[PDB]
Amino acid sequence: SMLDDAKARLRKYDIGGKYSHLPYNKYSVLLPLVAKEGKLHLLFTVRSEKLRRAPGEVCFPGGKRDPTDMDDAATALREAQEEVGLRPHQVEVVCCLVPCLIDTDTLITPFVGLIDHNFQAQPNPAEVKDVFLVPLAYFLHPQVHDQINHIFEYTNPEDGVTYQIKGMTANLAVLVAFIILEKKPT
């Protein structure tokens, strides 16, 4: 099936816990895969304008590890619950992709999660200004705009609203699209 095929692809890139004990400032992100209308989509957040780190930006759910978290996956799931109401029975964590090194002292670990068909996002306004889906295939032929560095623009056909996606967020989206959609019969 579509979903079994995605998970089987994703598992070949799982690095597991290999880089998780290293002495960094530690953050985790959740890459949430949603199946609608026979196709896969990624779920994104728009960060609240009130926050210290990165106000108004498009990012995946995630944040800083804390002492309650049993491991890096737990951080990602805690933070997704707090931001959009995603509960643990509603997500299957399939793998851990290559981590992102930043600022010489920080390591960000991404997890890919398959989201239950009855989940419906409840944006928490203290953290998140908006929540939106993008079809995974978009990231193979994106609408690119140079600021010199590359920015993606996605317009939702439901309502005509445009979103800008950039940096590590855009990089991870492309990676997941390649892993899952490369070399497929039609």
Ligand X SMILES: CCOc1ccccc1N1CCNCC1
What are 14's two structure tokens?
A: 């799982």
Beta carbon of residue 59, minimum distance to ligand X (angstroms, whole number)? 3
| Cβ distance to ligand X smaller for residue 9 or 65 | 65
| Cβ distance to ligand X smaller for residue 90 or 111 | 111
Beta bridge partners of residue 162, listed in sequence order: 155
Q: Where does this chain bind ligand X (CB under 6 A)?
A: 27, 29, 54, 57, 59, 62-63, 102, 106, 108, 167-169
Beta carbon of residue 123, minimum distance to ligand X (angstroms, whole number)? 17
User: Three-state DSSP class for 88?
Assistant: helix
**CA–CA dist 137, 85 (Å, integer):** 26
Beta carbon of residue 150, minimum distance to ligand X (angstroms, whole number)? 15
Query: Is position 83 annotated in a ligand binding site?
Result: yes
Continuous H helices in the chain: 2-11, 72-84, 167-181
Residue whose CB is nearest to ligand X in the complex, by number? 59
33 touches 113 (CB < 8 A): yes
Query: Is position 153 annotated in a ligand binding site?
Result: no
**CA–CA dist 35, 119 (Å, integer):** 11
| Cβ distance to ligand X smaller for residue 6 or 30 | 30
Annotated binding-site members: 79, 83
Annotated binding-site members for Mg(2+): 79, 83
